[PDB]
Amino acid sequence: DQQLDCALDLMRRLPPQQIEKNLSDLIDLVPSLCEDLLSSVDQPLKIARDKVVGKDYLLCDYNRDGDSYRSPWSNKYDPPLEDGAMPSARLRKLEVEANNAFDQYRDLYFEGGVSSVYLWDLDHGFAGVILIKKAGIKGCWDSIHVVEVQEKRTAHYKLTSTVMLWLQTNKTGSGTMNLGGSLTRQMEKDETVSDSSPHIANIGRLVEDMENKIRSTLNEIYFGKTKDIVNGLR
């Protein structure tokens, strides 16, 4: 659709820290684009509180059923639902283990912030999202990792990842400096699945590699390319 292409191009040119306002204004302007735009454009992550367990979790479309959101900690919807969408018993076991592992991953690499993992069954495997949010020192990092697992033994893993990052300083010499934007990348691999190399380990390694690669690329794009451009403006 020409209008969808145009809205997506708008979202690539408008200031990256205003995604929510720009998305909400676009949907106001062409309401029929709402569903397609929300499935194509990444939104900064929102934190909710699981008051039963006393833990924060992240909200996205993958843990939404109707107007409620499922906690990865309690496996319950807020507001409550009678028959909300749930992972199978087998996959809920993996999802608990994945939430615990990525909690630790997050602590070691981010020393703060909030993570959540949601898994869902597929025909010949399963898929999942790994979400990490760390606010700053003003700024915020949001990562969204969507992983698809086909089990053949050995499994095939497909990872699509988006990092959204903004940072702002206010200093005597440089005034106010704001850097904002995003990067999306994709990786694939086959890995052996065993008791010693389980899915969660294969997935963690793939997410780890992706975030390190993305961080390094952002570092040159943010602190390198835009720097060089400034130095040629004057």
């Binding site: 709402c34 929300l38 929102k46 898929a127 698809e148």
Partner: peptide, 15 residues
């Protein structure tokens, strides 16, 4: 991207 969870009702919406 793989499909999201099955059975999920409701349209996408802004938070």
């Amino acid at each position: 991207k793989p499909k999201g969870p099955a059975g999920k009702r409701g349209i996408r919406r802004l938070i």
